[PDB]
Design a protein around this ligand. Structure first.
Ligand code: HEM
Length: 154
């Protein structure tokens, strides 16, 4: 796919809001994912033992990885589709080292959309959500293409 400039503007406008509090958004999204899809937590040797949401919120390690992840994602979105270079090292580590199936990338996409809808209802109307979903779909399509090339495809 290819997003229009109008669609990228909707994505980047809400993302600017997200950037006012990177750690907080990173925390909310990861917790959303872990509660919605508990199996995903089993991929993190460092977070695997966290039993409750209270423990997840208190984990400094979890908050740090949330910032690392959001920062990587923000760098990709800001490329407005020209993210080939950024996708390479990311697809290799997640396919070969972490072994994250494509199914899981869909789970986190839903979590991101849920949190943005919760914290920014005014800047995340129907048009803005469709634009963000289009951006994430584009990301997943390219990542899956890289997975194939790397010999994985999960
Ligand atoms: C938009 C999606 C994603 C982005 C931008 C992203 C980004 C990152 C980044 C930057 C790291 C750091 C270095 C590395 O690549 O190993 C990382 C690590 C990791 N990611 Fe992701 N990731 C994404 C989705 C996921 C998903 C869906 C899972 C699991 C359900 C996952 C599991 C992991 C694991 C297991 C590690 C390493 C943790 C550690 O031992 O430090 N990632 N990810």
């Amino acid at each position: 796919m290819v997003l229009s400039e109008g669609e990228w503007q909707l994505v980047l406008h809400v993302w600017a809001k997200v950037e006012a509090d990177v750690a907080g958004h990173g925390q909310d999204i990861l917790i959303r994912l872990f509660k919605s899809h508990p199996e995903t937590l089993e991929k993190f040797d460092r977070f695997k033992h966290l039993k409750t949401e209270a423990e997840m919120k208190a984990s400094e390690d979890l908050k740090k990885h949330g910032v690392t992840f959001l920062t990587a994602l923000g760098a990709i979105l800001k490329k407005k589709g020209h993210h080939e270079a950024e996708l390479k090292p990311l697809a290799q580590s997640h396919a070969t080292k972490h072994k994250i199936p494509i199914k899981y990338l869909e789970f986190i996409s839903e979590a991101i959309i849920h949190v943005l809808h919760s914290r920014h209802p005014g800047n995340f109307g129907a048009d803005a959500q469709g634009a963000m979903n289009k951006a994430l779909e584009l990301f997943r399509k390219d990542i899956a293409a890289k997975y194939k090339e790397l010999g994985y495809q999960g």
